[PDB]
Amino acid sequence: MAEIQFSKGVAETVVPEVRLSKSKNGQSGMAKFYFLEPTILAKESTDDITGMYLIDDEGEIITREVKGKFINGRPTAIEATVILNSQPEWDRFMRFMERYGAENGLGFSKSELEHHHHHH
Template identity: 45%
Template sequence: GTDEQSVPDVKLSKSRDGTSGLAIFSFDQPSVFDSSRELGDITGLYMIDEEGVLQSVDVSAKFVNGKPSRIEAKYIMRNPQEWDR
């Protein structure tokens, strides 16, 4: 994988009972498109810190006039512990 240099716009939503949630990460003009030819397909979003790894394979690319312009990744938090992390 490769580290993305651009900072995403992040939208968070939480269920009414607070047990689950959704984070949507939107990267405009991400640098990963610059190196995608050498590295291959984008297979997921991996968030790595001292506590471990959070990952999602729900990733989509948006194209404008046939050129990549945006990546959107969704991370589902299935319990309160994942939300607190």
């Protein structure tokens, strides 16, 4: 039931890429997310996004480090960064990527393959 929401309640079937990277000072670890032609550009404006809600099978993680990627003043891609300052955070990140990657092979859409449910 893992899914990505930019405003909670908005399920995104988009297939964003996942990359791992370190902080600027190389202190705490973090991960980058690439969104290509996301639908959140037709509902809410990019300037209306201040964070992303990652809902995992167990709990959820709140991310406020979100930046939009504009091309020549033409919105088309959005980027997000997750901070892994805490240790137990890695457990959810690895599980989310493991289960999420299994459902979508970075090329398959989450929709269709994942059945929708009335609850949450």
